[PDB]
Amino acid sequence: AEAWSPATDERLRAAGIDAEDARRVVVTALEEDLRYGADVTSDATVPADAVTEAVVASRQPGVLAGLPVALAVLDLVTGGRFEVAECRADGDRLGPGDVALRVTAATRELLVAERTMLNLLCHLSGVATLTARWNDALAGTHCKVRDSRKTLPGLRLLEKYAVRRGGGQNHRLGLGDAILIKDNHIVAGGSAGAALQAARAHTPGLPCEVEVTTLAELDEVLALGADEVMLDNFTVEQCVEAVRRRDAARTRTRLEASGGLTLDVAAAYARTGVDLLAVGALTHSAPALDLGLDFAP
Amino acid sequence: AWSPATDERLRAAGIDAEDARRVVVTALEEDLRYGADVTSDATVPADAVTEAVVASRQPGVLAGLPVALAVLDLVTGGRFEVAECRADGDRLGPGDVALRVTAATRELLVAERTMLNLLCHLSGVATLTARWNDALAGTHCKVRDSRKTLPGLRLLEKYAVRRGGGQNHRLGLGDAILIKDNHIVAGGSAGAALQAARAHTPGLPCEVEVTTLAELDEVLALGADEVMLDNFTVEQCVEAVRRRDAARTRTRLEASGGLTLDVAAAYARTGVDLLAVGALTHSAPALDLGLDFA
Numbered sequence A: 001a002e003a004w005s006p007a008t009d010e011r012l013r014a015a016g017i018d019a020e021d022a023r024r025v026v027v028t029a030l031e032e033d034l035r036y037g038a039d040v041t042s043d044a045t046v047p048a049d050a051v052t053e054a055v056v057a058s059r060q061p062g063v064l065a066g067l068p069v070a071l072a073v074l075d076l077v078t079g080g081r082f083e084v085a086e087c088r089a090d091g092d093r094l095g096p097g098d099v100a101l102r103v104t105a106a107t108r109e110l111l112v113a114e115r116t117m118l119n120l121l122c123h124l125s126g127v128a129t130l131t132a133r134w135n136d137a138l139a140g141t142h143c144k145v146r147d148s149r150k151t152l153p154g155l156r157l158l159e160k161y162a163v164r165r166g167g168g169q170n171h172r173l174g175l176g177d178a179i180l181i182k183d184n185h186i187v188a189g190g191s192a193g194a195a196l197q198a199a200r201a202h203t204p205g206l207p208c209e210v211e212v213t214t215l216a217e218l219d220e221v222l223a224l225g226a227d228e229v230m231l232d233n234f235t236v237e238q239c240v241e242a243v244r245r246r247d248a249a250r251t252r253t254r255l256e257a258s259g260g261l262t263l264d265v266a267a268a269y270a271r272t273g274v275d276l277l278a279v280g281a282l283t284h285s286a287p288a289l290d291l292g293l294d295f296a297p
Numbered sequence B: 001a002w003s004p005a006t007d008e009r010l011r012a013a014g015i016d017a018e019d020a021r022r023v024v025v026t027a028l029e030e031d032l033r034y035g036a037d038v039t040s041d042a043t044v045p046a047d048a049v050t051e052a053v054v055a056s057r058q059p060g061v062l063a064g065l066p067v068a069l070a071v072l073d074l075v076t077g078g079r080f081e082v083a084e085c086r087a088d089g090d091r092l093g094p095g096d097v098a099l100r101v102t103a104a105t106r107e108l109l110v111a112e113r114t115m116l117n118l119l120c121h122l123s124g125v126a127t128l129t130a131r132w133n134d135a136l137a138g139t140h141c142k143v144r145d146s147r148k149t150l151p152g153l154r155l156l157e158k159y160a161v162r163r164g165g166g167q168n169h170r171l172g173l174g175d176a177i178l179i180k181d182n183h184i185v186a187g188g189s190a191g192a193a194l195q196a197a198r199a200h201t202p203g204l205p206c207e208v209e210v211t212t213l214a215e216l217d218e219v220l221a222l223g224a225d226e227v228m229l230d231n232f233t234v235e236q237c238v239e240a241v242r243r244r245d246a247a248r249t250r251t252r253l254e255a256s257g258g259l260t261l262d263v264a265a266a267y268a269r270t271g272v273d274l275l276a277v278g279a280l281t282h283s284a285p286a287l288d289l290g291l292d293f294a
């Protein structure tokens, strides 16, 4: 059914969801489910007549994300013919049994939207839930957790959204909106400093970060007064040493740790005094949150 | 569009090329909508050319290699050359080289994150399916996936389930009948729903999903073609298998409902025929693979 109402767009923008990218994910998702034909089960067992109330509820505890996008799915499928009794907001915690949403619509259109709505909800909520677990291992300290570009193909802007709902911070969104000098770059550049100066000269407008793999390279970029340094696969002892040299430099470089991080060692790392943790697992190994859709009897 | 040799390698693997194009193109647009690769354009010579290796830091099953190459084909307009490759479904160990390519250095640095996000997710899915298959070894029980896939990735994820030694369930709402709890709520009774579905399209096999041992007996009485056990315990599966063997029918039993790997080997020894596991596709940890230069 084409595209959705302007009301849905205002709801998506109000949430900080890129509405154009959300349309592309939603329409793609429904095509995967409907390209083999109409819902053969529902059309045989459910009158084209019925309307039900339906409850989206969690079977386990975590953080909710994706509710405006799931309602966009339903808006598209029902052509706006639905009504909402109750909803939670993305960011809210849910225990088992809690109701994220209660809606009423045509029973057949609910059966068509269900799996698409829940796949989004369960994945985005899984990302927000894991992000919150990391952010909680960082209480007591001033450390913050960040995502990366290790997102799933097609879902980057929505996974970034879900990390924010979990209390995390986004890193850059693509290759052209920020400079991040990695190892392949420092190879061809000759040193880390040459690469840092090359990027600053070539694109002085952009934010800039350099990823280092040794304390020596860390010394180069500190001398050049790098705004931000990423410590690739440092042990907790090495981070303490990195933080000492940073504190003794003329420039206050923000330090981010990346590579070799797990939820347990997270508090040990945060304790060294690094400012940021960059965790790929937030968006590429986030277990889904178990949410389900039930019809009112 | 990519070279037609790439279309052929995809068809030879069992991958839908149209859908793989949409995934690859969409994934590239995500990384490139903000501008060219500023970092590489500042630090990497435009004429540079390099050999790169994809290798796994972890053991698992490889899947997605024909798609990763399609990404490289697109980004390079065909100007690359493969020296070595494993096949999807091969077991990798720490250090194993899945692929060795030569291409323009800047084109490898643009492609690599899209290539690896595909490779690591699909191999993650294939690796987890293989673990389920190991826990089911010594049984006639097989593992199946579901429609709990990540949006846009269904066909590629179903492919990686097959590469990991598992079976595909139906692909969408229209290719098979599956009578769920909400069809029963919206429709009185589980046996009534089964009979309605049989009436409507007699040649289509009806799988019906039950939540109690009572419901099980009622559809077993109607000679149910195939039955899905929703959230039965291991001990209720054993009872269900007994009631099925006692009933006169050759009804196939499939268990599903929160199945986790640590109880997988137990569930396989109740005598059910299939386990439908959503975790294969919605909770598969990514397999750690990297792209390293010469």
Ligand SMILES: O=C(O)c1cccnc1
Pocket (backbone or CB within 6 Å): A147, A148, A149, A171, A172, A180, A258, A278, A279
């Ligand atoms: O954008 C990236 O490449 C990135 C961000 C955080 C950590 N590692 C990589």
Ligand SMILES: O=C(O)c1cccnc1
Pocket (backbone or CB within 6 Å): B145, B146, B147, B169, B170, B178, B256, B276
């Ligand atoms: O295709 C489905 O809807 C399905 C298949 C198995 C288990 N759960 C859902």
Ligand SMILES: [Cl-]
Pocket (backbone or CB within 6 Å): A016, A164
């Ligand atoms: Cl925000």
Ligand SMILES: [Cl-]
Pocket (backbone or CB within 6 Å): A114, A115
């Ligand atoms: Cl469903």
Ligand SMILES: [Cl-]
Pocket (backbone or CB within 6 Å): A200, A208, A225, A226, A227, A228
């Ligand atoms: Cl700077």
Ligand SMILES: [Cl-]
Pocket (backbone or CB within 6 Å): B014, B162
């Ligand atoms: Cl196959």
Ligand SMILES: [Cl-]
Pocket (backbone or CB within 6 Å): B112, B113
């Ligand atoms: Cl990268």
